[model samples]
Target: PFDAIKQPNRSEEEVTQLAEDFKDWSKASNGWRYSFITANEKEAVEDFSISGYQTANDYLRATDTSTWGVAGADARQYIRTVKSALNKLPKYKGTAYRGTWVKLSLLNKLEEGDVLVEPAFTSTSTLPEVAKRFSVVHPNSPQRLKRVLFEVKINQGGHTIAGLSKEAEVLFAPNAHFRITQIERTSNHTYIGVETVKASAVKNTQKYNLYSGEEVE
Candidate 1:
């Protein structure tokens, strides 16, 4: 069974310290779920728990924006930040690879959650050329697994967001916001796809504000 502990209340300054400690804990675990908090630190733990933020990724997403340094940059920047941090973890040492940036349309033919292996072709000589043209490289072997990552842009609404892993499906899912524009493969063979979200799809949409506990139209 998973263990849980309560944290004690802390001053604002101490709250900041608690946040930093949480980040360190996450990094030590290589980006997995949170571990136990000792009884002595209960106040600090309670402070963090009530902050409406859980997990190191959540904290990083809310605080770190040095990459784009603007509003609405969370989605893309979050993935980039998490990927970079995860790669630096001890388990992934020396095996870290970045996904190649590419347009989204090249992957439109594929379904969300659908993984594609190396496709058979008539000529091995042209494989490299074809891969380069599409911004995706052929895997080392047919059995290799490849995941997809993508960004969607809403032309009319002018909103762009990046999706990774399972979120990549939003690009082609029914009621999708945008059409794909480009695609590329990572050294690990993951496909990075980008799309332009349609205004029609986002029209009359509303979202909830977690902090305010209210919906925004």
Candidate 2:
């Protein structure tokens, strides 16, 4: 599950490159377009020019009306239509969790302490499942233990054990006191209970887990 982490910092060069790339894509005839601008529309360009908008994103933020008359009423209509179209783009229209995008560069910039989380699933589970469980802790169950317990049933084949060996390695990443609560073996299934201590008591460590037979820092 997604665990909260600090937002990362990016360099000025990275931001500039992103802005340039987005500007290029916005102007490309074959690139993504708003519904208002059809394949045959040439008037859209005139409307944008009249507004002094060189980029698609600028159209969304324009306020000057002095040039409307020069561009004509048709240009005004075009501006409104294009503005509506730009709003429909996902970056311009963000979700409840993330705010709306004013510029493509804003996607890479986040306020300090902005709550960000790792994707729930990336190939395999990255963070422990307990983190997600704790986040949803019941108000009435403050004293209830927030724990992660699971079972890995392995076949008698060598390949099955080899495949699971990597997954088992994830347990070592716990910073808190981790204990195998129970391990019961059956002919086809092996049950395991993995648990951690309270969050406040967990130690911050330099080494997290093993990688390529070396300690990962």
Candidate 3:
């Protein structure tokens, strides 16, 4: 489950201050850990077993367009996923932003295979309607939400975001699975949701449970 908290609206200065505070708080933490098991006890040998894996990819990737076809396309995909996840977390004063990514290690001991769920109270990406409404409520005050929206076009056919095949000109691929973990409020209204990717190998063997008769493991 996710922890959701609603905060009051904050002034722009307060939001900035909170962002800085969160930045410091983020730096104070180190790495977390998780573990995974591949085989059951029945399948394990007398002394053999399996452990989990660590993801090699960074949370974000970027490349220069001078030598590459498109710039920030792949980064945008990651950002989009982060934003999407944030949309479901709790919201504060009026808006949300993406915080830093904290890597974990050996975090598997905390697993309970149930679907972890949470509501997105705030959004990282600005919704035009919400911004408009906020502005009306604040009435020309800086307390109103300020939104930023823009797009960048990348010319195709050059370098890619590494680990990608050269034949694949487009960047930005969606991750198969991940998790939402943390949400923080910057001010009375602004907030940010921080998510960590749950590292687990996905093996689709198409195997079925013989007894219960389900098409799952």
- What TM-score would each prediction reach against the true structure? 0.20, 0.21, 0.22
The segments of candidate 2 whose C-alpha lies over 4 angstroms from its true place after superposition are: 1-12, 20-37, 40-51, 54-70, 91-217
Which regions of candidate 3 deviate over 4 angstroms? 1-5, 25-176, 179-197, 201-217
Query: For candidate 2, lDDT tens digit of each residue in 79-161?
Result: 45444433322221110011111121321232322211211100111212312222333233322222222321111100111
Tens digits of per-residue lDDT, candidate 1, 1-217, equal 0000012334556545544553444345433322332332233223322331133224332444454445336434433443332223322111111122222343334433222221110001001121222225644433333433333232332210110110101111111233333444445444333233343444443422211223334
Better of 1 and 3 by TM-score: 3
Looking at candidate 3, what is the lDDT of residue 148? Answer: 17
Ranking by TM-score: 3, 2, 1
> What CA RMSD would candidate 2 show?
23.3
Clashes of each: 20, 0, 18
lDDT for 123 in candidate 1 is 9
Among these predictions, the greatest TM-score belongs to 3
